[PDB]
Amino acid sequence: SSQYIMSTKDGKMITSDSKPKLDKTTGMYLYYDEDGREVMIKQEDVTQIIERLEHHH
């Protein structure tokens, strides 16, 4: 239900409907894209992970 957004050091922004899972072996954050499969983003490229809560449930 919560909405996730990741901010990239370069200034970009990325959304996801699932909590991105950090893979310490590769320092890669796995997450799911809109209408699609999983995708990868480097841990070091991510400045923050933002959770936006749902309240109208």
Side-chain angles (χ1 to χ4, degrees):
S1 304
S2 269
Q3 171 67 56
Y4 287 87
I5 290 177
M6 310 177 76
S7 284
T8 299
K9 204 175 192 305
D10 64 17
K12 295 298 186 300
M13 184 257 303
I14 299 173
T15 66
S16 177
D17 291 301
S18 299
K19 176 186 172 64
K21 205 155 181 292
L22 176 55
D23 184 337
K24 283 202 176 180
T25 303
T26 61
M28 293 280 176
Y29 262 109
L30 274 282
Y31 76 88
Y32 292 76
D33 79 310
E34 331 70 55
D35 286 297
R37 197 200 69 170
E38 56 198 1
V39 34
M40 240 173 261
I41 181 72
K42 304 189 62 60
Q43 204 287 295
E44 55 172 49
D45 273 37
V46 179
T47 59
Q48 52 187 23
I49 294 172
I50 311 169
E51 173 186 34
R52 280 173 183 174
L53 276 52
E54 273 189 358
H55 293 115
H56 294 297
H57 38 58

